[PDB]
Design a protein around this ligand. Structure first.
Ligand SMILES: [Ca+2]
Ligand SMILES: [Ca+2]
Ligand SMILES: [Cl-]
Ligand code: NA
Length: 615
């Protein structure tokens, strides 16, 4: 069997959020395959909008699911702080939530203005490569008083308010700052009513506000109550519920998600009030998800796969079962009735399904457990240099901790980078899941310890190199074809100051009465390089080189044309001479007429040797 370690699992789930980081990364970052990215986010609107999380396997920063994810992560630290502490993961949980809330503070530039998206969906998704080298424009979009977004603003207010609670013990001034912004955002949500996707209309095609904003208005208010213990916010929360309509008709067949936070709001209000409206609605939902909801005369129950997974729909199936399990866990830690036992058992069984107890006999958490998914739908972890999903054929990097979309309604599943149902990853997928892992550690994790010095720095493959071949060679010249490659991935990096050197031995020239001045270096077919005349490398041994420089030419791992540039160059002794001998030339060794990588044409970036061997 797989020997589960819930401290390790929790550690890895938080490492997933570290892999999602946009912006300038700290020096002490645990992932050597992530570098600075999105550094111009907000420049088109004159703001520093850098930081935050990439949503999924893409690089749009979608505000509504980012707020949701930070809120739920904060919620689980609020409920299960001791589990985070004893598993060693509290510092990492706070540090990862702070990455999101720091971005919310930058996005909240004015009391009634909130930047809600960076990146355009079509522009971002049309290109398949690592975040560090994104070549497209990344526009920023906002809501404000003239074009509001009570769902986005309310959900971000909830994220800041919940975060303000969990940061207070270790950073009271940051806590106070989070809380002050949360009050402003909630006033924005309350006073200027509308769905954010009616204003940031790009979001309609990815994170449409299907449920509207009445749920976020309750959600933000109750979180502000929990964060201030001021009665006005509880009153506002309860008043906002009147817009939910007749309590007999409250929905119960969905679950907590980035779109519908009704299920979180009513659960929090049930604990605060014991009002039968919220208690009954919570239990209708969790009955429907677990044993079945009894109408007195019939039993209504969510679809279950034959393998035991509670199956809501085709996309992010595991995310939905995890979100339900988190509600079940939190409710079963509150309520005293038999429903506490039934919901707890449900939550454990669903969590055990996605950790390996399923017909596929495999974990659905990348880099954890038995036979985890190897091909999650994730641009930067895959690391294509060619703008193609099947190049390379395996991921360059391990996206530790990511919960994939998972099986279909018949437990079917395919570990395929293009299978979006199976292998999508996303910050909202991992948010409640992270809390469920904390609870699994509390319940079953005695003696579980996290992994030390983890993860190990990945050893890079060849990232910068020339492939070269011999065009022709005579007794007075050598002509070379070269393609200078940037296939970087540890981390991927844009390079516009790449160069290489081609080394020759001129001993036979000196013996014949000639010198380096008599060799002419010329370019033929050329995609933007300069080729120097010969320069000395070792004067005593008559070793010279030509410097071939693509200075000012952008080369980067983002497409078949983007990752390489070509130049053909010739080194010529005077016409009619016969001394020229390439066979003792350092950079000529092993070359054939077929283009092939060579370690003897060293490559430089801004003058720094980055690959290959000098003589
Ligand atoms: Ca909503
Ligand atoms: Ca020679
Ligand atoms: Cl290209
Ligand atoms: Na693989």
């Amino acid at each position: 069997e797989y020997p589960h370690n819930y401290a390790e699992l929790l550690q890895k789930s938080l490492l997933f959020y570290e892999a999602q980081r946009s912006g300038r990364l700290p020096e002490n970052s645990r992932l050597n395959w992530r570098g600075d990215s999105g550094l111009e986010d907000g420049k088109d609107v004159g703001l520093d909008l850098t930081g935050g999380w990439y949503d999924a396997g893409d690089h749009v920063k979608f505000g509504l699911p980012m707020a949701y994810s930070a809120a739920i992560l904060s919620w689980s630290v609020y409920e299960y702080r001791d589990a985070y502490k004893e598993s060693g993961q509290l510092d990492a949980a706070l540090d990862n939530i702070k990455w999101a809330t720091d971005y919310f503070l930058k996005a909240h530039t004015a009391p009634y203005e909130l930047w809600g998206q960076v990146g355009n969906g079509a522009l971002d998704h049309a290109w398949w490569g690592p975040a560090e080298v994104m070549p497209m424009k990344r526009p920023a979009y906002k809501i404000d008083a003239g074009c509001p977004g009570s769902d986005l603003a309310g959900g971000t207010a909830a994220a800041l308010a919940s975060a303000s609670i969990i940061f207070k013990p270790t950073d009271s001034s940051y806590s106070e700052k989070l809380l002050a912004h949360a009050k402003q955002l909630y006033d924005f949500a309350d006073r200027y009513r509308g769905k954010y996707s009616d204003c940031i209309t790009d979001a309609q095609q990815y994170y449409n506000s299907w449920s509207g904003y009445k749920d976020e208005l309750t959600w933000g208010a109750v979180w502000l109550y929990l964060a201030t213990e001021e009665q006005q916010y509880l009153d506002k929360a309860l008043a906002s519920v009147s817009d939910w309509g007749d309590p007999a008709n409250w929905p119960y067949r969905w679950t907590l998600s980035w779109d519908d936070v009704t299920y979180g709001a009513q659960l929090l209000l049930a604990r605060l009030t014991n009002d039968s409206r919220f208690v009954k609605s919570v239990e209708r939902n969790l009955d429907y998800w677990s044993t079945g909801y009894s109408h007195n005369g019939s039993i209504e129950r969510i679809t279950y796969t034959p393998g035991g997974l509670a199956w809501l729909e085709q996309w992010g199936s595991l995310r939905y079962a995890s979100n339900a399990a988190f509600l079940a866990f939190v409710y079963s830690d509150w309520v005293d009735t038999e429903k506490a036992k039934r919901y707890r058992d449900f939550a454990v069984r669903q969590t055990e399904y996605m950790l390996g107890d399923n017909p596929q006999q495999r974990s659905f958490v990348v880099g954890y457990g038995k036979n985890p998914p190897k091909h999650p739908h994730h641009r930067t972890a895959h690391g294509s240099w060619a703008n193609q999903m099947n190049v390379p054929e395996n991921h360059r990097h391990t996206l530790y901790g990511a919960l994939v979309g998972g099986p279909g309604r018949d437990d079917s599943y395919r570990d395929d980078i293009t299978d979006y149902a199976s292998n999508e990853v996303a910050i909202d997928y991992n948010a409640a899941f992270t809390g469920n892992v904390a609870k699994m550690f509390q319940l079953f994790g005695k003696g579980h310890v996290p992994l030390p010095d983890f993860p190990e720095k990945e050893t890079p493959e060849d990232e910068y190199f020339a492939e070269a071949s011999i065009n022709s060679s005579g007794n007075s010249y050598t002509e070379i074809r070269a393609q200078l490659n940037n296939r970087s991935g540890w981390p991927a990096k844009k390079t516009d100051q790449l160069s290489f050197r081609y080394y020759v031995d001129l001993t036979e020239a000196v013996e014949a009465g000639y010198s380096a001045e008599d060799i002419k270096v010329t370019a033929g077919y050329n995609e933007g390089a300069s080729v120097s005349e010969l320069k000395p490398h070792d004067a005593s041994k008559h070793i010279y080189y030509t410097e071939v420089s693509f200075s000012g030419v952008l080369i980067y791992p983002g497409g078949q044309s983007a990752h390489k540039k070509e130049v053909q160059f010739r080194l010529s002794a005077p016409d009619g001479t016969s001394f020229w001998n390439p066979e003792n030339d350092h950079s000529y060794q092993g070359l054939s007429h077929a283009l092939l990588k060579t370690r003897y044409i060293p490559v430089y970036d801004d003058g720094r040797l980055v690959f290959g061997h000098e003589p």
